[PDB]
Every structure is written in C-alpha cells, then in structure tokens.
Amino acid sequence: NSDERDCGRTKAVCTRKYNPIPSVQLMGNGFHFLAGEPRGEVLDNSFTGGICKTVKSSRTSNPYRVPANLENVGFEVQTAEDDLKTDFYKDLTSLG
Amino acid sequence: KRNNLRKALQEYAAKFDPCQCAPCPNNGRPTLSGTECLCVCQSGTYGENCEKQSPDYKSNAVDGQWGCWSSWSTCDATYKRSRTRECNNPAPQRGGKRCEGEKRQEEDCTFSIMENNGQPCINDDEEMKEVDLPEIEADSGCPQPVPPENGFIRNEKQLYLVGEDVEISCLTGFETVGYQYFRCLPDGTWRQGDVECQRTECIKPVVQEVLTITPFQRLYRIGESIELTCPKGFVVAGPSRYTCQGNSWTPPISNSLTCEK
Amino acid sequence: LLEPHCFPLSLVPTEFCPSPPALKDGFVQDEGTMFPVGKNVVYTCNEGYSLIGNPVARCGEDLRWLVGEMHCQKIACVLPVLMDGIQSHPQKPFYT
Amino acid sequence: EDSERRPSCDIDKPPPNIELTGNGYNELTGQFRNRVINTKSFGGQCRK
Amino acid sequence: QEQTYVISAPKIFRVGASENIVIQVYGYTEAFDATISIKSYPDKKFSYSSGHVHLSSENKFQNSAILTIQPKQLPGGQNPVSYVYLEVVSKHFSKSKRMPITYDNGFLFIHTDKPVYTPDQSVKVRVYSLNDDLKPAKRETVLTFIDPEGSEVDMVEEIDHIGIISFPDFKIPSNPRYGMWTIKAKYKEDFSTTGTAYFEVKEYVLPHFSVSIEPEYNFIGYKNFKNFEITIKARYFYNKVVTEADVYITFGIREDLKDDQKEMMQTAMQNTMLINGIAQVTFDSETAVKELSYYSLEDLNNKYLYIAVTVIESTGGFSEEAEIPGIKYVLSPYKLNLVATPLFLKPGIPYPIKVQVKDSLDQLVGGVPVTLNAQTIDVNQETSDLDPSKSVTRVDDGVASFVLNLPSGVTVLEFNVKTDAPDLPEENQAREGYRAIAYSSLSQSYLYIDWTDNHKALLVGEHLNIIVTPKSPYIDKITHYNYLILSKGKIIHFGTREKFSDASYQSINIPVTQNMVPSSRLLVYYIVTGEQTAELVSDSVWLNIEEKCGNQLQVHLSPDADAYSPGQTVSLNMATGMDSWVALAAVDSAVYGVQRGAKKPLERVFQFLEKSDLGCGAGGGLNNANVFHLAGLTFLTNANADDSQENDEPCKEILYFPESWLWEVHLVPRRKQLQFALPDSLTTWEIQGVGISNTGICVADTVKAKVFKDVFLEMNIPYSVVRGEQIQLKGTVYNYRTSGMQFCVKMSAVEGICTSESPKCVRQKVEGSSSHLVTFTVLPLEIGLHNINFSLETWFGKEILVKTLRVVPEGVKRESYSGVTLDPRGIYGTISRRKEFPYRIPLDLVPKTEIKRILSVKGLLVGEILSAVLSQEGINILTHLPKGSAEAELMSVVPVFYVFHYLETGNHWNIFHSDPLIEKQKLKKKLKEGMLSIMSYRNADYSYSVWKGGSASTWLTAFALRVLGQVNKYVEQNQNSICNSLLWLVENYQLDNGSFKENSQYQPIKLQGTLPVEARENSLYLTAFTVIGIRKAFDICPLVKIDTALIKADNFLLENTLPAQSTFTLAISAYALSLGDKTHPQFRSIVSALKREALVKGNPPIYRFWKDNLQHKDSSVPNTGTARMVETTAYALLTSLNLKDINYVNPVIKWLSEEQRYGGGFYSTQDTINAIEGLTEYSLLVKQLRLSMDIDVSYKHKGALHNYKMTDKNFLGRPVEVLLNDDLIVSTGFGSGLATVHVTTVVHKTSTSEEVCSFYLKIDTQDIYKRIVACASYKPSREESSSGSSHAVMDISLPTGISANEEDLKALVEGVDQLFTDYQIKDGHVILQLNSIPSSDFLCVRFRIFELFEVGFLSPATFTVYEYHRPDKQCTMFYSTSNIKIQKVCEGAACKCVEA
Ligand SMILES: *[C@@H]1O[C@H](CO)[C@@H](O[C@@H]2O[C@H](CO)[C@@H](O[C@@H]3O[C@H](CO)[C@@H](O)[C@H](O[C@H]4O[C@H](CO)[C@@H](O)[C@H](O)[C@@H]4O[C@H]4O[C@H](CO)[C@@H](O)[C@H](O)[C@@H]4O)[C@@H]3O)[C@H](O)[C@H]2NC(C)=O)[C@H](O)[C@H]1NC(C)=O
C-alpha cells in the first residue's frame, strides 16, 4: 500500500468491481523443467498497471480484468484431444 | 545476479537432469525432483511409475529416449570444445521415435585472464553516460582552462586543486616563448603564464585523391620548401614549389595539381 | 570459534611469554605477575631520556617478544663536529 | 491512534485451512504435529 | 530477559589512545569473567588489545578494561582501515559490534614568535605536541609552509622528545607574496591530527601608540540612524594615555564585508582634538546619508558603514591609524539563539531556557529585554498554554534567562522567543521558535538528573553533589543506578549508586579531579526488567569545570617594580607545582598593534582541547540510544536498544630594538630563575610562559614589564626609502619629568645618507609631562641597510638611538618567470634532464641595481595507483590451448611473448611458490621455441601465411612484424630477415591515397585477426594494424624507405579517420597514430573524438568502457561482441597510455580488471593480447612517473649551488637564492619520475630609459596653500607623424591629507577647449582621463592644494599615466609637495650632495 500511504483525491480507478481471469496466477508461476511441475509465484498476476483492460468470456458472463503481465487472453473452447477406444469379446459354448 | 543465475542453472542442470534415471517403463518421460525420479506416463498407461497398460495399448514394445552428455572433450584446433549424447536411454526400438534435439554441442574455449577480487555490482541501465552534468566544484579549485592558440594541456583533470599548476605545450609546428605554466589561485582563476607558441616547422597539406604533391619530409623547417607534382604528362593548377611563411604557405587546398595524368 | 559462550570456557590464559626484557635507562610502562600470549607491553625511558624507535612489544605465539630495536637516547645536546676546530668555551660531555 | 491505523488490506480471510500447512510431521508415525510455521504473517502486504 | 548486560565505549576509537571500556551486568548471583577485546575487521584475525575482567557481588557486577589499537599493528596500505570490532566473550554471553576508528590522536598547538613578520625575517615556531591522554606525545612531526596563494613552499621535520618541538628558523623567501601564510603540521606517523596557525608577511614598522575606535553598538538602526556615538582612545605602549592629538575621522558607504572600493562623504570628515587619552565622536548618519548618499531613507539599507581614523600626536610627529570596517546598517538587528538548552523535557524538574543575541560583526548584545511564549501538550493531543514571560540579557555574560515549571505529564513543548525593546517595529523585531520532547521510554521507566545544567563552572577538586531520581513502574528492581563521567573522548570515572530504604538513591558525590578541566559530561543509566521484558534507561548532563592547570605554572620578574629601564638586567622566576618543562617567548606589545584584532598566540587553548568531546549539546535525548549518542558513547546490550539506528550531524549546539626575544625552552625543577637584559625598546614586554609535563599543557598569566625613562627620543623612521629621493625623518623628544628642560638632538649618519644640516641644534626648551617635534632631512644616496644614530646629549645621562634605515631602487618592480619540467625518460615528448637558465640583463635597469633570482622545485607526485594483475591462471595463458593446423600453433605461441613481457616488466615472479630464477629461465626456453615457431610461417619472399600452400597475407605479415618487434627488446632475431619482410610489405602493398590492402585470404582466421571494418573502408583497420606492426618493428630496422612509407601511411590514416566510422576503427587508428607525432594537430582531434565516444559509471567516472556497435545483449559466455569491446577498449587504453596520463587511464584499468563481459575477451589472440598489453604498459607508466630524482643545480662557469633530493617521502624543495651573476645549470641523474623547477627573476626598471613610456613626464610645486603644474609630451615611432597619443588614464597622487581645489579642477571639464573627459578621486589619488596628448610640445596643466596634514613621514607622490587604448604603455615619476634642499647630481652611478 505504500503508493497510497497518504493521498488527496486519488485518480480514477476502473469503475465497477471486476474479478480477475480464472486461474490467472498459474500464468505467473514458474515451472521446473527437470521435475515437470510448478514451483513458486514468479510474476504478479494480481498487478493492474494503472489501466482498465478487460475481456468478455461470453455475453452471459460479467467482464474479467486482465493483469498488465498478459499481452493477449481469449476464451474460445476447443477440444485439442479426444480419444474413445472400446473393445468387446463374447464367447458362448454349448455341449450335449 | 542474472549471470550467476545462468551459471547456476547450468550446474543445476548437469546435476539434476532426468537423463540419469533408469528408463521409465512404457514410454514415460523421466522427471527428477532433486532426490528421486518419477515417471510422467503416456495416456493409456497407469500404476505408480507407468508399469501397466490399458487393453487398447497397441504399439506395445515400441521404445526410444535420450541419454546424458559426455563430459567436455578438450579443445580443437579452432579452440572449440564439444560434448555429445548417444540417444541410448534406451535407443529407439521397434519403430519408436528418433531422439529430438541436437546430439552435439560446440562451445568456445574462453578462460579467466585477470585476478579474482570478488564480483562487482552491475545494473542494466546505469553504464550509459557519455557526457554528463558538471559536479558542484565544491573543492573551490580551478576547472581545466582553455589553452592558447595551437595549444595543448600536458595532463588533464576535470578540476585542479588550489595552488596546483599545469603545463601547456605547442603543436608540432611551434615552440613556446614565455612562461609555459598556469597556476590555480584560491578562487578558481588561473594566473595565466605570459606565453605564445612561435612557428619553426610546417606540414604536408590536405590534397585531393590524386597526390598532386611530392612528400619529401614529415615536417618542413621555415625557409625550406615543398613541391606540387604531376604523376605524368600534364600541368593543372598551383605553384610548382612553395616556401613556408610563419603562417602556413597559403597552399592550394580547394584544388591542387590535378593534372591530366 | 564462532559461538564461544555456547561451550565451557577457559577465559584464563594457558600460554605465557617469559618476563619482558629490560632497557638501558628505560622500563616497561606497565607490569604484571604473568604475560599472556598476544599481550602488548610498551617501553618508556626514565626521566631525561627519549625512546627512539617504535615503543611497542608483543608476546608472539612463538612464546617470545616481537620488538622494534628501540633505544633510550639522553635528552641532551652532544657537541657537534667542530665546524673548523673552533674553541667551544663551556666544554662538557653533554649540554642540557 | 484511530488516524494512525489504516486498512492494511480490503479483506481479512485466509485460504480455508492454511494453518494445517504450517504443522509439523512425524515420519515414523505418519501423523501431523503441532504448529511450527506461522502461516498468516501478512508482512504489510495485501496479497489477494 | 532476566539476565542482561551493557558495555559502553567511545563513539569512535582513537588509534594510539588508552580507551577505557566499562562493563555492567545484571541478574547474576554467582561470579564470572569476561574478555572485552578489540579485533581486526572484517576478518577478526588479529586481536589488537584484550583485557580480562572479573564480575562479582564484590565488584557490584561492574568493571572496566583499558584497551588500545597500537598505530603500527594496523595493516596500513594505500587506503587506511576505517573500522574495527569490539567484542566481548564471557560465560553466558558474547557479541561484537563495528566501531569506527580515527587517526586524529592528540593536539598540535603551533606557536609562532610573532603574529606578523616582514621580508628579511624568519619565523621561530614550535609545536606543543600532546596525546589524547594529554601527556607529551614524542612523535616525529612535519610542519609545512603555505604561501598566501595556497602554493606550498617548504616542509621541515623534527623528532619530539619533550612534548615541545623546536623547528629551524624558516627564512621568508627572497621575494614573498604578502598576506596570510599558513603553517600546517602533522605527525609523520600513523596519525592525521592536523594543527594549523597563521601569520602575515607585511612591510611594516611597529606602531608608536595604540589607537582604538569603540562604538556604542556594532550596528546602526532605528535607535541611532538620527545620530550614532563612538569613542576614540589612545595609549602609548609604555601604558600611558596620549596627552594631545589631532584626530581626523572619516565615514564611507560600504556594500560587502568581503571587500569593496566604495565611496565616502567628502563633507562630514569630522575633525577634533583628543586630550588626556580620548576624543568623543558622533555621526549624524541621517544627515550625511540624506545630503550626499544615494540613500534618503533607512529602509534602503541592510549594508555597511566604514569608519576610519587618523590620530596624530599634536606636537609628537608619530601618526597612527585604525578602522572599524563593517558597522552594519540593519533593520532587524537582534538575531537570537539558545545556549546550554537541551531541547529535551522532564516533568517537575524545571526546564531552564537561555538565549543570546548578536549584532552583525557580532558581540553578545547584552543590554536588551526578550520575551518567551509557550504551549504544552500532554495527553491524547491535549493542550495548555503558559503565561508570556520576560527577561533581560546580562551586560557581560550576553545571555538572558528564563525558567519554566510544567504539568507532570507534559509530553511535548513548543516555545517561541522574541526580542522586546523600544526600537522594535515588531514585524522587523527578531524571533525564533523551538520544540522539546520527553524521553519516550517504551516501558515508561525514566531516570531524571536533578541538576540545573549551569553555565557557571564547578571549581577543581570540589565535591560535586548531584541528585538523580529513577521514576519507574518497576522501582522494586532498580537496586542501583550506574554513572560514567566523560572528559574529552574518554570514560574517566565510572561507578554505582545504591537505593536507600526511603526509596531514594546515593547522589553523585565526586571530587571534580584534574582530568575534567576544560569541561566534562555525566551520563547515568540502569537496566530494569518487567515480567519478561527489559529496558536500558539513561540521562546525561554537561558540566562546566574550572580552567585550572595541573602544573600550575606561574611566572614573575623577581625585581618587582612599577617600571624598568632601558638595557636593565632583570631576573625572571618560573615556579611550578611539579617537575616541568617550560617555554618562553617575549613580544613587544606594539607587535599586536599591526595585525588588527590579532589574538594572543595560544589564545583559548582549553577551547581547542575541548573539541575532543565525541558527544555534543548540553544533554538529554529522544531515547536511550539518542542519550548515549549525544553523550559521545556507543553501547552493546541485550536490553533492546542499539545506537546503530542513529547517525551524526555536523553539530552546532553551544555551551638594540628587538620585536621579540626570550625564545627559549627550559626544565624548571619546581623553581628556576633566569637573568637577562631587557632591551632598549621603551615599550611593554609581554612574557608568555607555556608549561608542558605529564599533567598536560598550561599557559601562565602573561607577565607585562614596562620599559620606561623620564626623558627619551623616539623616531619615526619609515620601513623603506627610494634611493635618491630626499625625505623628512621625524620624531619627538618625550619629557615625563615634572620639570621642563632644554634639550638637543643630533643625527650621525654614514656617507651614503647625506644631509643639508652639514654636521648643534636650537637646544630647544620643552615642558614637563610634554613632547616636541623633531625633524631631520636626508637623501639616501646608496641602497642596502645603513646606521643612523640620533643622540640627545642632554641632562639625566647620554641617550643614543642606535637605528637603521633600508633603501631600495627608483623604478617599477617587474618579475619575469622561467622553468622546465625535468624528465629523465621522455614521458612528455623527448627526454630533457638538463636546462641552462640565462643570466640575461635587460636594457632599462635602474643604474647601479643588483638583479635577483630565486629557484624552487615541485615534485609532481603520481596520485593513486590501482592494482591490476594476472592470476596464477597466468599459467593457463602460457601453457596455451594446443598446437594444431592453420597455425593453432600461431594462436598458441603469441600469448607467450605477451605474458613474458608482462611478467618481466612487473618483476611479477613469486606469483609462483617456485624460485624466480628457475621460472624466468624455464619460461625463456618456451619463448625461444615460440620464436622458431613464428619463423616457421615465413615464405622465402619474406612474406608470412596461415598455410604453406596459402597465398601471401599482409595481415599475418604485419602481425608477425608486430610480435617479433616486441621480443627483440628482450631476445634477438636477425635484422636482415625483419628488414626483408618489412621491405616486402613496403614494396608490394604500400599504396597512395590509402595503404596496405590485403590479398583476399581463403578465410579470415576463425579466432584471429578480428571482425573487420567490413562493408567498406576496411582499409582503416588494415592501415592501422599494418602501421602498428611497422611502428613496433622500426626500432630493429630503421630504413629511409620504410620511414617514407609511414610518412605516407600515417598521413593517410589521419586524412581518412575523421568522419567517425564505427568506434573500433577510430580506436585502432588512434592507437596507430599515437605511436607517431603525438603533437600533430589532427591527432589530438582524433583523440578528442575517441574520448567523446566513452561510456562511464559513477558520479565522477569510476569505470570507463568503450562500445563501437552497440550490440546491447548480455553475455555470460563472451560472444564476439565482447571481443569488439575488449579490443576497442584496449586500443583506447593504449592510446591514453601513449599520451601518458594516469588520471584518464585509472577508470579504464578498473574496467579491464573485472568480470564485466566475462573472460579473456572472446579468447581471440587479438583481444587477449591487447588486454595483457594494457596491464603491461600501465605497469610501465606507473613506474615511469614515480618520483626519485636528485636534481643538482650549479652555475655554468661558477660552482655548485644546491642538490634537491626529490622523493616519494618528500615532494617539495624550499627556494634557494640564485645569488651569483652567472647562467644556471639545473641537471639530474637518471633515477625515476617527473618534476618541475621554476626560477623567478626580479628587476627594477626606469621610466625614461625604457619602451614602457610614450608620454614623458615632469611636475613642479610652487607657492603662488600651494599650486602645482604637471608638464608632459607624447613620442611617436620614427615612421609616424605628430598625430598625438591614444586615450589615456592620468594619475596625480597627493600626500595623505593634502587635497586639491576640485571647484578649480572643474574648469578642466567645463572649458570650451576640452582635453579631459572626466575626473575622480580614488584610494586618495586624483584620476583624470585624457582623449589624446601632443607630441609637438609639453602639455602643461596646473592645479591648487590645501593641507589637512595627516602623517609625520610622507611617501613620494606618483605623477603617472597609462594609455587606455594601450594599457601596457605605463609611465611614472615620483615627487612631493615639500621643498627639496639635499641636492647634487653627477654623470655617474653614485654622486655627492650639497645644501641647496
Ligand atoms: C653610531 O653610534 C654607534 C654607537 O654604537 C657607534 O658605534 C661605536 O663606534 C665606535 C667607533 O667605531 C666603536 O668603537 C670601538 O669600540 C671598541 C670596543 O668594542 C674599542 O676597543 C675600540 O677601540 C679601538 O679602536 C679605536 C679606534 O676606533 C682605537 O683608538 C683604540 O685604541 C682601539 O684600538 C685597539 O683595538 C682595536 C679593536 O677594537 C684594534 O683593531 C686596534 O689595533 C687596537 O688594538 C673602539 O672604541 C664602538 O664599538 C661602536 N659601538 C659600540 C661600542 O658598540 C657608531 O660608530 C656610530 N656610527 C655612526 C657613524 O653613526
């Protein structure tokens, strides 16, 4: 808060409350290539940069806010892999 | 700190790269935690470390994975070192992939010339300054004076102390008459020595891309002479021979003896 | 070495020099029953004498005093070499 | 003083069992053990 | 926290001081031990001092250790140790802390035998030299003379045996700069300890009598602008008031206390008679201001009045003179400040407040009322406001004082103070405001010292009795408080003070012992516990102590008398309370009358001795840390504080006829008596005795002894006289008999000082208690020093004045300088180690005069030298990366030649553990193999190439030539092969309008050569590199054809480097050209351009790089852009080193010497080579400049004159008089380094017989108050007509108190036949400005004069002029208003005289 320790009429913040993008801090964790896993927060994806850039997930959603570390974001649902494999075996024997 | 973190990343990689694991069964990628290997499984393989297969696992018995670097081979005739990896961890079997990425590395053989005295602090932007603001002059000395015509200052400070002194000097054509030192007084003034450079020598003038001149000497003493010349078979402009006049000769330098060679 | 008070301690010394040497017309400016390893002592001349050379002496780990080859000069002028064999009427061995 | 106090952060609520992450562990009994790390030192920062 | 400790120590440790360190422990009930110790920093390797101390109930768990850093046990080096560790170890605890240290130990009181000296005198000086423990120091001391122009002039050393150090009697150099020379003194040991004093060289006669001007206030303001009142008073130096003197006052407008030349009221020149010692003077400042100033209203000034006075003994001939320059006009005089006032509060204890007031050119104003206002704050920003109060300043002590009593919870105070007097328009009445705060204890536990902080001193040895009250929530646990008494820097006493059953404590009952005497400081402290927490609580107070010595040295003349008599033998008695040394000096009180407002030479010795207090202010503090810090202490404690949170401020909270003799030092064995003659001087002798012994310094009360007789002559003989001018010597016979008498006076003189009187006086009468003017007229015919004897031959015995006159020549002093640097190595161009200064004699010389010469030497020291070295990793440079194809052999061998030149030139062997002789020989063999190897790349054409089947390479040909050039300085190869290879290059590849193109090699070598200046103009890289090979080889094959080829190739390289191609081009080309004529014009231009390209870090440049291509990337592995840097920098470095200037080089060597862009460049040959060449050529320049030079000076035909042994131990030589009439040879042996030597020539030159005069001068004084006519004419060159002179400034000087008829002078301005444009009076001279001067005839101009005669002796007036359009054309003649009667003239250098 030290940028706001004592102030007069503060500059205009973005008007409504907006939530951040879903899971946005995973975009700012560091990854450990030899262990194959995330390890620690490296980029601050709660930082807003003094700006109001925003993304609409759907006409149905409220707008999300974009943290200043991100150059582009988008919500286009895709199915990059889909695999269904199934096999059946049936045997019937009758002896008289 | 950046550079040290590069160096550390390399040492960390050499120490903890998953290549040194025994190969993970059923095509799993090895991963290494600093203490143990764990197998990242292919889709359709399961168990603790990829041991067992789904009933749909056709392309069973297919294999292939890369292995650890051989420690640097000593330098070649272009002072480059190299290391290689054999792709034998295991080698590709029954139609499995080729190993990805380069199998050899080539690196210059640079080494440390000067004595270690601990790392300096360097910060990305700071080095920039070519020319900069004046310091306060709070020492109350004298800044570097303006030397006289054809002048020079034998040793250069920013600012000289109170009572300090400076020797002027004459460019190669000339010699000092009068007292060739100035001295800093208690207020920033300089006690300018009564001095003037007197000519004794002269120098080959600037000339065009065809010589138009014969360069007999480095310096010419006053009362000697220099000659404009044509390489072959013509005459154009300027005196054939000229002698020096306490000033320079008033030589032809806008154009010289640019003859039809 | 780093955390000495964390352990049983011999704050009392267990190695000492022999007693410091004398000077002609001078003495050690401090005195004791014993002189531990690493201890400094300092020499001063008796009244009317001046100690030329560095006054300082240390009991080394060799169990012997490092010293500066110090010399107690008497505080009197000697007659200089006579400038031309001239009569120096109040002739004396020393001039106060 | 009421003028010297300020809101350190918008909100005062930790993740839902963060205290269990600062417990000790016994390797031989496999049980968790009592509080070793202070998991709620906010360090004067509003880390949401 | 039930067990706790404090250790307390000085804020700074002084090296070589016996620092006393207290320990206190708390919460312990069994005894133990600790080792307080001083250790080296950072490393803790070396214990400098350690003490071992026992803590027990019997010691009340308090102790101290005495610890020191011996000056020689510090590691020394180029930059001195600034920090040390104080450690404690004990059972239960250890800790350590960084303590600053200082080399300021003890005091150097320079004492000089006079405040003033003349030319042809010398300056007996000594240094009282005492430790921090105030005992005699016994450290060798150097003392240094600084000219008024700040240039140092000598150094001198002596050893200290006694605490008194008597230096050789420095003679003032044969033509000095007048003004305030400075003596600085330092120990030539591991101490800083500068002392300083001043003395003025001036051309003076001691004053006959004192004059004082004494104002009612040091400013003029509302109270007095109407009129101001000032007292003029006078005494003879035989302590008798002046009987009757005419007195002339003068008043001037002055704009600045620094200086000006501003003007004055020409009316209001108030005149009066001083009678029976005094005249009263009043200035109606309004009247003269409104009538004559620019100013008409008081509001117009916050500027200065200057008042000046001439006193003239009315029948006594002597005149003396004074001023109070800078009596300020001010509209808000009374500036205020606190004294002795802590700005820290307590409840219940009164809060005394004291203020002073000052004038401009201050004194404590002392006669003024002042008023105080206060507001107080306690609980939750609750407020209560006090009644206004008034006080008056004490007329002597300057303070005005107030005391306040305060609510029991007062938490802050603010107060204002304003002046309160009748003359105050309150918006222009001065005021100040202040704030004060409680002790801010987090535990609300306090310790209030009950004392009243008094400015009045405690007497030595008396019992001080201070109450201290520990108010606290936790008084059950405060069984005692502890105290420390601090004097100068040191804890001198310490103790403990127990709780009585009445819940009150032992007071601080201490004798104020002798170690306290300038001042002392009391600090008091305790640690207390809560249930678990603990707090260190403290308070501190300043104590003024009586200024009494331990030696108690006392002096008297034992024949106790009102007055003594001329030539009298007298006995002086020294008594002392202990065995002591003593030093004596005697001065004529008239000496202190020359330097206006001069001190006693050892004035306020106890003040300077007080500056060693490490604390500041009167006491108190914002918290425990602030209390100890302001007390000058620091502490280690576990009880929750550390003064590390605080840092200093430059604090300002405040609390025969000799001139001198008896300059002697004696042992006084408790009593001593000396016997000596008082001199013929009829003046008070002030005898000052300075005692030195183990108790410290003392200055005895100055004994005054009058020398007096009922009748005597005194004579105003002036300080110097123009040869051939005739002057009035004047004086007076004094008669202090009750009777009158008849008297005579007669003058005896040598042949060279002739007179009209033809030697018998009037035998004139005089009254009792009276005096009569004496007048004698002489022409000093010959220069030098001469006796003149004036004798009284009258009743009450024979009186003879044995007196001497100085005589100097009739012409303007012109000074001509000469000098050379002495350079035995040709650092700055050619070697030059001898010079032969001409015995020239100009034309204009004053006929019989002697020309004078003075010579002195300045050693130009190196400055800071920065360490840069190859490691034992140097083995890897030598044992290079392998032999192999395309001459990876070549790349392996070139490193060997460079590393060998580095190891050789720096003597760097013993980098190994090996024997240096073995390694040198072992390496040499490897170098020889390299020679055969590099030869193996040669063609029989004497070309070189990278393959045997490879075509010719100019690049490798140049490179091989460069490298073999390097080796032949040390190990040889055959000149023929080199010469052939040079000639091969110079035949086959020398071009014109360019040079040395390269034969299109299969490849540029993959890690050799360099990235070219590729795309075009790579000719600049090639020419530079090829020239670099040739310039390194030419010394081993000098050939006219090769030389001719450089005469082309250098010139082409100059003529094409100019348009600023990428900087690596400019750098290699600059380096190449720097081997050439370093003083050719365009080379300096190219060098300058290279300098502009630089890059730097730091406020001044700490590092300096260069970059050519701005490849911005990082490189932890040094990609080839790294090479472009390391190589372009090395070329710039080597350019700079070729110009020989460590000051430019130093930040570059820092840059080379570090990781930076890592490794040996890209590990090319070319970068790595040039980088090692950098360290090599730098280590050369370092030794090249190093001063060791035995400069030997002899005349040419005549003998030796001196031998200055210039060294790194002493850089400076005193001027030697060049006495003899011969050419002077300065010379030196080879030695090392560079110096410079100066000779100044002084001569006196005539006006008429010289080229300085265009406008030839005459003047005549005639009775027909008097009138004066000047007559003068111009002189053209032989080729020019009588057009007349240019515009000129003409000066008519007049004797002081003579004045011209200005309203007659106006006719020279108002007349229709105009000549002069304007006139002014300035410095008492008349100036008039003249458009042109006739050469056809003497222009004659007449004026009239009136005399307010001002002086007994009058200097000759100049009639003088210079051409304003030609200001070097200066002409002068000397004249006076008085009639002349000593006259004869001859056709020779010296002449007779006759009486008119
Ligand atoms: C200004 O006043 C001062 C006052 O001091 C004058 O100074 C005095 O001047 C006189 C004369 O020069 C000088 O007198 C000599 O004093 C000596 C004592 O030191 C006497 O011994 C000496 O007598 C000898 O010389 C006489 C001739 O001058 C002889 O007549 C006599 O017999 C002596 O001769 C013997 O001794 C001398 C050596 O002195 C030797 O060479 C002979 O062969 C022989 O053996 C004089 O009385 C005073 O000394 C000076 N002042 C003093 C006493 O200090 C000064 O002269 C006046 N100057 C002027 C011109 O104004």
GROMACS .gro file of C-alpha atoms in nm, chain B residues 152 154-156, chain E residues 827-828 1067 1070-1075 1078 1083 1087-1088 1090-1091 1094 1104-1106 1128-1149 1152 1174 1177-1178 1181 1185:
model
   51
  248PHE     CA    1   4.755   2.165  -2.557
  250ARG     CA    2   5.008   1.804  -2.085
  251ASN     CA    3   4.790   1.627  -1.824
  252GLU     CA    4   4.411   1.660  -1.800
 1328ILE     CA    5   5.740   1.074  -2.090
 1329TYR     CA    6   5.620   1.405  -2.239
 1568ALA     CA    7   4.027   0.335  -3.164
 1571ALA     CA    8   4.403   0.646  -3.279
 1572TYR     CA    9   4.636   0.385  -3.127
 1573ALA     CA   10   4.831   0.359  -3.452
 1574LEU     CA   11   4.861   0.737  -3.482
 1575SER     CA   12   4.954   0.766  -3.109
 1576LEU     CA   13   5.284   0.590  -3.181
 1579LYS     CA   14   5.165   1.282  -3.054
 1584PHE     CA   15   4.593   1.351  -3.394
 1588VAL     CA   16   4.200   1.157  -2.971
 1589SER     CA   17   3.930   1.401  -2.865
 1591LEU     CA   18   3.766   0.893  -2.919
 1592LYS     CA   19   3.725   1.048  -2.571
 1595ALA     CA   20   3.337   0.682  -2.399
 1605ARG     CA   21   3.523   0.378  -1.826
 1606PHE     CA   22   3.440   0.147  -2.122
 1607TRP     CA   23   3.403   0.189  -2.496
 1629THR     CA   24   3.833  -0.132  -2.882
 1630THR     CA   25   3.887  -0.052  -2.513
 1631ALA     CA   26   4.241  -0.188  -2.519
 1632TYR     CA   27   4.318   0.034  -2.823
 1633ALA     CA   28   4.173   0.336  -2.640
 1634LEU     CA   29   4.363   0.244  -2.322
 1635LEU     CA   30   4.684   0.206  -2.520
 1636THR     CA   31   4.616   0.542  -2.691
 1637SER     CA   32   4.576   0.700  -2.348
 1638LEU     CA   33   4.886   0.529  -2.208
 1639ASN     CA   34   5.080   0.651  -2.514
 1640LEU     CA   35   4.979   1.007  -2.414
 1641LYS     CA   36   5.096   0.919  -2.055
 1642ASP     CA   37   4.811   1.030  -1.818
 1643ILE     CA   38   4.721   0.807  -1.519
 1644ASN     CA   39   4.423   1.032  -1.440
 1645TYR     CA   40   4.245   0.933  -1.764
 1646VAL     CA   41   4.369   0.571  -1.754
 1647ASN     CA   42   4.270   0.476  -1.398
 1648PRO     CA   43   3.893   0.417  -1.453
 1649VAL     CA   44   3.974   0.222  -1.773
 1650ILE     CA   45   4.210  -0.012  -1.587
 1653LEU     CA   46   3.968  -0.414  -1.770
 1675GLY     CA   47   4.715  -0.295  -2.131
 1678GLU     CA   48   5.202  -0.065  -2.050
 1679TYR     CA   49   5.013   0.052  -1.741
 1682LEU     CA   50   5.359   0.417  -1.681
 1686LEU     CA   51   5.613   0.877  -1.329
   0.00000   0.00000   0.00000
